[PDB]
Amino acid sequence: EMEKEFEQIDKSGSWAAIYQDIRHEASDFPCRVAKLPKNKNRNRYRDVSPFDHSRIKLHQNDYINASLIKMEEAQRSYILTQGPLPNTCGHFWEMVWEQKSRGVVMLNRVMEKGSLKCAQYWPQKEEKEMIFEDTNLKLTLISEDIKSYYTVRQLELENLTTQETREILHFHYTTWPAFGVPESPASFLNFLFKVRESGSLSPEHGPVVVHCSAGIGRSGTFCLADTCLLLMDKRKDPSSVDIKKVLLEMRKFRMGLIATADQLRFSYLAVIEGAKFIMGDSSVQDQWKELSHEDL
């Protein structure tokens, strides 16, 4: 089916050739706001910026390194953003608020092979809530479900102005290395379906916010798999979804999505395995959970 094209590329060993092609064919749009001097300290990497046409605007300086990926045919939107900086934690939650997101998926760790990939932007203790005074927000850990390779936290975001509050679900994947891949499709798809079940992806909410270190590599992998599985179901045809065309479509909205040839391969592996659920084998989901060893 689609399992054809994968068995082929694996034998001929041409994954990097495929990946290099996407880099060549990918959109290239202006990033002028991101390159302004006043925004130098709001970008974590000098070669990773949001396109002007799809960048999120704070309702304030309105700049944040984050992009709205609006997949029209899949009928889902995501916001991909960089791991917040010490100075952009208030902007990040300002964004989450103004865009009405319900979920945040974080695929990196704050500490990653000695390198600091992210600021501690959410509170780790119920009793020590965070207050972001530049954006007038207050953030409180309410509860947390810790699993072997990921943690779900429940948070309360308070708009200190209006005093309204919202519940935000934080899904933190802790065993996904930079420029690397998850341990197995089951552990990934189990994670993805956890996020799906929470309702955080439902369209009555704003786009889910997805980030890693740069918001392009692991974040790209997570969003491509989810969208491919969405198109599988909508089109009602597994072997109809062409991962390459989908990834290029996502790259109209943010540069550099999917960071290694292996991450692209895993993307195929995950969509192929995920089709079992889409085709009707609704019970493969329980298989993924047991395979993922999420307990202890």
Place this chain on the structure above:
Amino acid sequence: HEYYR
């Protein structure tokens, strides 16, 4: 460094 490379 501070390049994604």
